Ligand SMILES: Nc1nc2c(ncn2[C@@H]2O[C@H](COP(=O)(O)O)[C@@H](O)[C@H]2O)c(=O)[nH]1
């Protein structure tokens with residue numbers, strides 16, 4: 001009834017991912033529902049439990065969003081440890097995962113990542129800078145035309 | 153009845169992880185059962201299905217081993233994308249996870265990784281080169297003395 005897409009992008013406390021997150025959030029919300037909202041909130045909602053929350057909460061928030069997230073999509077030009085972990089949980093929790101790696105960033109996907117992309121429900125596309133939009137448009141266009149993730 | 157510990161280490165087709173894998177395999181097997189055997193086999197068992205197997209098989213082999221692996225232990229000095237993915241699956245599939253990061257390697261654990269270590273069943277210890285043995289000895293000694301992973 002309701003589709004939810006979770007975006008996975010390494011921020012590392014950077015201000016170069018927020019711009020991408022704001023633009024990707026609007027595109028993901030247009031289809032059904034978009035998560036990864038924490039990386040775009042200029043008003044940390046106060047009140048609640050008076051404890052030392054932070055990193056532990058970060059992991060808990062991502063776990064709760066993936067529960068509803070019917071599909072996961074990632075956009076990282078370099079091998080991110082934190083983002084890689086999220087991808088692993090997405091495959092174990094969900095099924096249809098997406099990965100966007102820049103084929104001209106300099107780095108490369110390790111054996112574990114390459115192996116993960118069996119072709120069933122996990123697809124790893126290569127986007128070269130200005131090609132990120134093409135990959136996102138093709139991913140959303142191919143998803144609507146297929147109406148599922150069964151084809152290899 | 154039978155305990156199985158799966159070791160997680162970034163190899164990236166390198167010959168610097170095999171030496172560590174051989175020494176860690178013996179220590180892990182001494183306690184109960186050790187996996188990550190693929191990274192130490194000089195005799196690829198032939199025969200079987202005649203297909204293009206490789207990366208997909210790598211991911212499938214790790215998934216099958218974690219099923220029996222009651223506990224997971226990792227030893228990486230730098231943020232590894234492939235290894236990070238395995239850790240995510242270990243927390244989603246199992247529960248008691250271990251992480252060994254070098255506090256003098258140069259890099260650092262991202263927000264996702266730090267958050268993952270809630271202190272419940274996931275413990276991230278810092279080992280400085282020659283301190284890898286100390287972390288492994290304390291991890292195995294603390295596991296036998298506690299007889300479980302409940303303490304925070
Ligand atoms: N749900 C959720 N995800 C988070 C939070 N903090 C970081 N993340 C996710 O963790 C990733 C960033 O990992 P890092 O850049 O630190 O390696 C991104 O995919 C981002 O969405 C948080 O508080 N909640």
Ligand SMILES: Nc1nc2c(ncn2[C@@H]2O[C@H](COP(=O)(O)O)[C@@H](O)[C@H]2O)c(=O)[nH]1
Pocket residue numbers: 110111112113159160161162163164165188190191209210211212213214215217232233234235238
């Ligand atoms: N079970 C299993 N694990 C593998 C295989 N190939 C690589 N790995 C695991 O993947 C990790 C290496 O990832 P990478 O160094 O390529 O980032 C190690 O933890 C290693 O045990 C394989 O064929 N089978």
